[PDB]
């Protein structure tokens, strides 16, 4: 789906539309022998938030053979810790140190 | 008796997982393990293909 720069100036105040953002971290680059390019892409919009709150882990593919690809994250040491019950009621954590 | 709450076999949960695969990144090493080596750590491998 692609929107226009004229409609982004006339959209009603309380009507929330969705506008998708492209990734592109895992994309194989072109071969050595192929046609070149001429004066390319111009992007016109940018979020200032940032727009990524749900992550956990990203791009689970290896680079070369033994290292992380530039800009990839692993799961946090919190969703991987089953604690114990409280002294009486609910749930606890580690405890640390 | 009144019967307030009803019971279930397996719990659901509020927060679940999602994924977007890239259908061109396949490793050429079909690995293998035992059957109990499979079951416990089984469906979790097929959510992180």
């Amino acid at each position: 789906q692609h929107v226009d720069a004229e409609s982004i100036m006339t959209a009603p105040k309380g009507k929330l539309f969705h506008l998708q953002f492209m990734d592109g971290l895992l994309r194989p680059e072109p071969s050595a022998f192929d046609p070149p390019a001429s004066g390319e892409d111009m992007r016109l919009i940018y979020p200032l938030q940032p727009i990524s709150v749900a992550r956990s882990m990203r791009a689970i593919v290896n680079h070369n053979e033994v290292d992380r690809p530039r800009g990839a994250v692993a799961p946090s040491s919190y969703e991987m810790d089953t604690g114990t019950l409280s002294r009486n009621g609910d749930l606890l954590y580690s405890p640390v140190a | 008796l009144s019967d307030d709450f009803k019971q279930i076999s397996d719990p659901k949960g509020y927060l679940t997982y999602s994924v977007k695969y890239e259908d061109q990144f396949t490793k050429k090493d079909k690995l293998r393990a035992s059957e109990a080596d499979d079951r416990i750590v089984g469906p979790t491998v097929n959510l992180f293909k």
């Binding site: 895992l26 194989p28 290896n62 | 396949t26 490793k27």
Partner: peptide, 27 residues
């Protein structure tokens, strides 16, 4: 079963030309 015999074997060799794949490996 009746007469004791003797047989022979030779380890076989199998190879095809290196096939073409369309799936990429690393980033």
């Amino acid at each position: 079963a009746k007469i004791a015999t003797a047989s022979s074997a030779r380890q076989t060799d199998v190879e095809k030309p290196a096939d073409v794949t369309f799936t990429i490996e690393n980033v």
